[PDB]
Design a protein around this ligand. Structure first.
Ligand SMILES: [Mg+2]
Ligand SMILES: [Mg+2]
Length: 1240
RNA sequence: AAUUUCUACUCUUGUAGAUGUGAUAAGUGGAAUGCCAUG
DNA sequence: ACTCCACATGGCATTCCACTTATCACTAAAAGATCGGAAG
DNA sequence: CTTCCGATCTTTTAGTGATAAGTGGAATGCCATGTGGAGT
């Protein structure tokens, strides 16, 4: 009988606690006068300068390695094709093996162990790779093998400024070893080549060959654009899109050339662009030819490749010049404005714009491409000018319409024909517009310039002037000056003169926009090192004089002590432990042996002495260094750890590959005995009570043995020190004493502590000291942030503050990773039938909506989480989102919205977790594609689709409730672990512990009472005869004489060509045009039943705004206008389709589409209800405006309710699942059939 | 209207909830401006 | 107190911003470089 | 006047089994369409 309290101590999690350090006593004088802060600031600055200098070596080596790659890519393409054909486990394993094989084949060039290279080149690559992650980068032991980097004297000084400090780059070495490795890291060069870029290139090749097979002219078009751009002159376009061409496109230059082939080289702005592959395909589609209809079915976009991991991008496009400071942009703009003033732009522009009143307008022309701008700016709509032109061309006349459209689409038009088509109103609006634009330009030129671009007003005035100048340039670009059509000579010459004068303003606008929108400078913290190469990397007492980090405890206040280097040497400061009743500090005594898996072979088998001993003779060697008794290394022990092959004989890989269970068991037992002897004999571990360990032959696998052994090697004890010694040490300057501090260590605190304060207090509590459940970690780091009753706004930023980031580890007694975590949760849900569901719907109108259901589908609690603790967070997020949108267009400080969303979700996660604990339920979420949620966050960044799964999963991974006692599960020492260990979103399955993912579709627009959905898809009824065929497919519809509602019948075996392909459980439906009378809810508000909300499509091409519709009222109005009698209750459908008028059939289809729309939304009045087009067997049509608590209230509440029921389906199928596994997704047919069978 | 830091506050020199840091790399999405086209 | 109206989209290019996603470390001790004093 | 070497400070190192990712596509929906401005 498993229990809900059993979900604890399953896996380790690592957390970082952050505290402010208060300098205690005279330590601030000693840390300031020795210049540690300034030296560490200079060290950080030199590191930031030196990082790209070092990166040049890695980029050069990666280039020189990747130009030598010569592989055959047919096997990987075949593997991907076979995986895409059928998604099964065996083909997935084959694809994983092939990807690993190619990732190793790429990695062999970096190592220098490939057959297809010479021995000298391989030796050079091996000797380059050997010193690539060491101090050989600094002292030139590997730089002279390359030579191409060509470091100058300042770069050499920067490189040698880190003398005896190379281990500062240790984390950089770990970061850069991920790149040159083939261990399936996403941030690796071979993984990027094999798994990221190659599927994109294969899809591009398949797209190209399909496109060429469909139409032959696109081959000539692609050859012409490839010749015109100027890339790959030796390879044809049939050879570029081929598998052997992927031996290139590995270095960044070839990738950028391929991307410029796809996208197109761009010249300077104001000059015609050379099109790309995607651009010319979009141009061919937009022509609306028959070939466009051919292409539209095909997938018509080539996918560009990704950047290489280190090499920077370069392009053939016009990289436009940038300014460097506010002084330069103001001085350059003042010079440009002065130049425009003495050249006298404005009087000759006004002469041009008043010359139209006394000139023959037949010798002037308007550019064809910009007539839409004039139409939008001058008249009520963009279509008015071209509609007038079309009517005028008709008035002076099948094929003639095409001739008129072809004349209007590409040939310039004179202004006299414009003035004949439109009349006096366009003339007066035109001169008014030029007068307004010239007035704006004159006002901009007379207005002085601000000095600096610091505050918003000084940037807004600059934008106001420069946009007016751009508007005058746009107005001046209206006229056509080219010789292809007739034009007055002197006017054209002077017009191109003033346009040539005005040309650089458009580039000036872009330069000022690129400068003015930069992020403002803000002071940031930097890592302190106290002139120590390895400061605070470990708390151990053996390393306490080299690391310097020692913790203390003083009557509940926690202190940190740093002993600096004295005259450049490590003075081993020692403390004498005294009697416990003496007043003073309690020193923390750390005892650790970091990991048995890495430290048993290092201190036993991988010594230089042992390896040198075993390459001449097989006699066992006795080791005496750091051993109380001489330990013996035998021959078979050394060959167990060095088997001259990748799998070792005592590990699970050998047993899986070979199957020799007996040999694996013998090797494992020998290794356990050897580790026991080693831990018995080593001085560091000779006092460890190893009697609690199991015998050697009982362990199933070595990882279990290490997971059991590791908690025994960690220990903390506290020793008393006299206060006089510590005070003398901190006064003399031999010790820097800081107090670990936050809000909860203040004088007057009353309430419950912070969660991290609970972690810190529970780490050093006596019960955790007796048995370690929370582990204090190394690699602590110190940061210094400078300067950026008496209650003061932003008091914390008024002075410099020392920070202290310290990692901790929770659930230390557990394993590193859980052992089949989902099996335990599935077993617990299998043995517990009555388990609720806390299903969640995410959106933007309602940010989070939840519904809690029981096992029988009833509603326990439904509630919108737009407001928590009397704060409507959705309105605040909407205001912030609108402020950011309006601020990024006025060149303001955009700011951050992540903080407010995190604040809102901190409340939401607490409410959801509180319901989880109080109901002992599961949480079902909707499985949304990353593209969809990124698109919806792009449209409105108020939304919380992302940043909600991550916080919920990370909270449930280590859930500590503040109220609960520490010894009880759920306390600070026994956290709840209700989710699987979070590694990455890609590797997450459909179930993560108690959190469930169900498919998204058919959860909102579904009737909760009977499970009806709209069966049609409205894209297939675009034409009138299809509307006739859709109309004759229905059985009947007639007016009920006693209830006043039209009852339309449906049989599901009809209109299969218009259905979306989901036959429901029911064979028939009763679609009802309900009587539009007044109904009252529980609160007494009136509403009209059957009301629908539909956007207006009166223009037949655009989506207008919403309007209220009444299907019964408009239906009876249509039928009374037609005069068709219906009071006898007879079927009207054959009486209706007997006429050939398109208006009646069109409004019939419109009414049917409107009545079948379940979701009715109107953001202006705040209405999100659902009305049901069909009738329940109880004789009540559903309407959520009744607001009965047994049924959902809004549409998002309905969405949450059907997320809950979709997870109810999974839990219902779990009870009959003998394999303790869930379904492999839920098909929409299965879900609809299940819900419609449950309702009926 | 105080906070390691974020969010909502002020019976309380503080309250309630949350908070994995550092480093590196990549991608996505907005906005402005150009070019070719579409309604 | 009513009613009309606000140009929109597709493919690329440049710059700027914000935000997300995916790896590594959470480390004592063995090995190697350096140096001040002893010995020749 | 020159050479060695034991102390001491940086620097590099050692490396387990999680076994996962369970598939089901063939297309849908998953959510919403600027909401706010003006004259008369
Ligand atoms: Mg939903
Ligand atoms: Mg929803």
């Amino acid at each position: 009988m498993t229990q809900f309290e059993g979900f604890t101590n399953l896996y380790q999690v690592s957390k970082t606690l952050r505290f402010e350090l208060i300098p205690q006593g005279k330590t601030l004088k000693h840390i300031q006068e020795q210049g540690f802060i300034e030296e560490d600031k200079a060290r950080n600055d030199h590191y930031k300068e030196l990082k790209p200098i070092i990166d040049r070596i890695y980029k050069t080596y990666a280039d020189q390695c990747l130009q030598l790659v010569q592989l055959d890519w047919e096997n990987l393409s075949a593997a991907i094709d076979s995986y895409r054909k059928e998604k099964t486990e065996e083909t997935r394993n084959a694809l994983i093996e092939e990807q690993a094989t190619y990732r190793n084949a790429i990695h062999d060039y970096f190592i220098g162990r490939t057959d297809n290279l010479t021995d000298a080149i391989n030796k050079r690559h091996a000797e380059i790779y050997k010193g690539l992650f060491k101090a050989e980068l600094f002292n030139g032991k590997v730089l002279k093998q390359l030579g191409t980097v060509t470091t100058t004297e300042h770069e050499n000084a920067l490189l040698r400024s880190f003398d005896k400090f190379t281990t500062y780059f240790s984390g950089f070495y770990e970061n850069r070893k991920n790149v040159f490795s083939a261990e399936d890291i996403s941030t690796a060069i071979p993984h990027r080549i094999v798994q990221d870029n190659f599927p994109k290139f294969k899809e591009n090749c398949h797209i190209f060959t399909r496109l060429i097979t469909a139409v032959p002219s696109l081959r000539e078009h692609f050859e012409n654009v490839k010749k015109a751009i100027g890339i790959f002159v030796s390879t044809s376009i049939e050879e570029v899109f081929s598998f052997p061409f992927y031996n290139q496109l590995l270095t960044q230059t070839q990738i950028d050339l391929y991307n410029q082939l796809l996208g197109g080289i761009s010249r300077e702005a104001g000059t015609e662009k050379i099109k790309g592959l995607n651009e010319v395909l979009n141009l061919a589609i937009q022509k609306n030819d028959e070939t466009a209809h051919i292409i539209a079915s095909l997938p018509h976009r080539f996918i560009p490749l990704f950047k290489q991991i280190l090499s920077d991008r370069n392009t053939l496009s016009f990289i436009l010049e940038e300014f460097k400071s506010d002084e330069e942009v103001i001085q350059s703009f003042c010079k440009y404005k002065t130049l425009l003033r003495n050249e006298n732009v404005l009087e000759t522009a006004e002469a041009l714009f008043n010359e139209l009143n006394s000139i023959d307008l037949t010798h002037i022309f308007i550019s064809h491409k910009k007539l839409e701008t004039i139409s939008s700016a001058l008249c009520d709509h963009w279509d008015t000018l071209r509609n007038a032109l079309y009517e005028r061309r008709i008035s002076e006349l099948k094929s003639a319409k095409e001739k008129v459209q072809r004349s209007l689409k590409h040939e310039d038009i004179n202004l006299q024909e414009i003035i004949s088509a439109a009349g006096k109103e366009l003339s007066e609006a035109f001169k008014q517009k030029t007068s307004e634009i010239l007035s704006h330009a004159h006002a901009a030129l007379d207005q002085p310039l601000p000095t600096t671009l610091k505050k918003q007003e000084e940037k807004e005035i600059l934008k106001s002037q420069l946009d007016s100048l751009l508007g005058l340039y746009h107005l001046l670009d209206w006229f056509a000056v080219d010789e292809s059509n007739e034009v007055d000579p002197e006017f054209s010459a002077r017009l191109t003169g003033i346009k040539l004068e005005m040309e650089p303003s458009l580039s000036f606008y872009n330069k000022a926009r690129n400068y003015a929108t930069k992020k403002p400078y803000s002071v940031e913290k930097f890592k302190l090192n106290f002139q120590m190469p390895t400061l605070a990397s470990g708390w151990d007492v053996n390393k306490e004089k080299n690391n310097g980090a020692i913790l203390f405890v003083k009557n509940g206040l926690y202190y940190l002590g740093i002993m600096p280097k004295q005259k450049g040497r490590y003075k081993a400061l020692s403390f004498e432990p005294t009697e416990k009743t003496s007043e003073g500090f309690d020193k923390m005594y750390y005892d650790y042996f970091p990991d048995a898996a890495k430290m048993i072979p290092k201190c036993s088998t991988q010594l230089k002495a042992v390896t040198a001993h075993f390459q001449t003779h097989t006699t066992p060697i006795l080791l005496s260094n750091n051993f109380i008794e001489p330990l013996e290394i035998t021959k078979e022990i050394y060959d167990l750890n060095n088997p001259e092959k990748e799998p070792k004989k005592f590990q699970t890989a050998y047993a899986k590959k070979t199957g020799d269970q007996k040999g694996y068991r013998e090797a494992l037992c020998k290794w356990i005995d050897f580790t026991r002897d080693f831990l018995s004999k080593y001085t560091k571990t000779t006092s460890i009570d190893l009697s609690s360990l199991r015998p050697s032959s009982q362990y199933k696998d070595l990882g279990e043995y290490y997971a059991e052994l590791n908690p025994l090697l960690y220990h903390i004890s506290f020793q008393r020190i006299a206060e006089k010694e510590i005070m003398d040490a901190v006064e003399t300057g031999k010790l820097y004493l800081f107090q670990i501090y936050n809000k909860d260590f203040a004088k007057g605190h009353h309430g419950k502590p912070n969660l991290h304060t609970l972690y810190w207090t529970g780490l050093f509590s006596p019960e955790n000291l007796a048995k370690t459940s929370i582990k204090l970690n190394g690699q602590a780091e110190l940061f210094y942030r400078p300067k950026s009753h008496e209650i003061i706004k932003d008091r914390r930023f008024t002075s410099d503050k020392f920070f202290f980031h310290v990692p901790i580890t929770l659930n230390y007694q557990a394993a590193n990773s859980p052992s089949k975590f989902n099996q335990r949760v599935n077993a617990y849900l299998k043995e517990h039938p009555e388990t609720p569901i806390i299903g969640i719907d995410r959106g933007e109108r309602n940010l989070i909506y939840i519904t809690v259901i029981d096992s029988t589908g009833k509603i326990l609690e439904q509630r919108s989480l737009n407001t928590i603790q009397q704060f409507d967070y959705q309105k605040k997020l909407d205001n912030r989102e609108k402020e950011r949108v309006a601020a990024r267009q006025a060149w303001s400080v955009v700011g951050t919205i992540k903080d407010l969303k995190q604040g809102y979700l901190s409340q939401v996660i607490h409410e959801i977790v509180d319901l989880m604990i109080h109901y002992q339920a599961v949480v079902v979420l909707e499985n949304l594609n990353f593209g969809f949620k990124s698109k919806r966050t792009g449209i409105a960044e108020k939304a919380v689709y992302q940043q909600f799964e991550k916080m919920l999963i990370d909270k449930l991974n280590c859930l500590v409730l503040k109220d609960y006692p520490a010894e009880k599960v759920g306390g600070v020492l026994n956290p709840y672990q209700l989710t699987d260990q979070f590694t990455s979103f890609a590797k997450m399955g459909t179930q993560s512990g108690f959190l469930f993912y169900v498919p998204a579709p058919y959860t909102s627009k579904i009737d909760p009472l009977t499970g009806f959905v709209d069966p049609f898809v409205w894209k297939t009824i675009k034409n009138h005869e299809s509307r006739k065929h859709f109309l004759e497919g229905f059985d009947f519809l007639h007016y009920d004489v006693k209830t006043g509602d039209f009852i339309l019948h449906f049989k599901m075996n009809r209109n299969l060509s218009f259905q979306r392909g989901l036959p429901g459980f029911m064979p028939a439906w009763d679609i009802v045009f309900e009587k539009n009378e007044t109904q009252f809810d529980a609160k007494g508000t009136p509403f009209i039943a059957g009301k629908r909300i539909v956007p207006v499509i009166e223009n037949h091409r655009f989506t207008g705004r919403y309007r209220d519709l009444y299907p019964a009222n408009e239906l009876i109005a249509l039928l009374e206008e037609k005069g068709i009698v219906f009071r006898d209750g007879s079927n009207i459908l054959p009486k209706l389709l007997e006429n050939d008028d398109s208006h009646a059939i069109d409004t019939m289809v419109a009414l049917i589409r409107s009545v079948l729309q379940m979701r009715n939304s109107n953001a202006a009045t705040g209405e999100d209800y659902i009305n049901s087009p069909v009738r329940d067997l109880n004789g009540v049509c559903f309407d959520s405006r009744f607001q009965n608590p047994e049924w959902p209230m809004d549409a998002d509440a309905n969405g949450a309710y059907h997320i809950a029921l979709k997870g109810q389906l999974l839990l219902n199928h779990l009870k009959e699942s003998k394999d303790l596994k869930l379904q492999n997704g839920i098909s929409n047919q299965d879900w609809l059939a299940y819900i419609q069978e449950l309702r009926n």
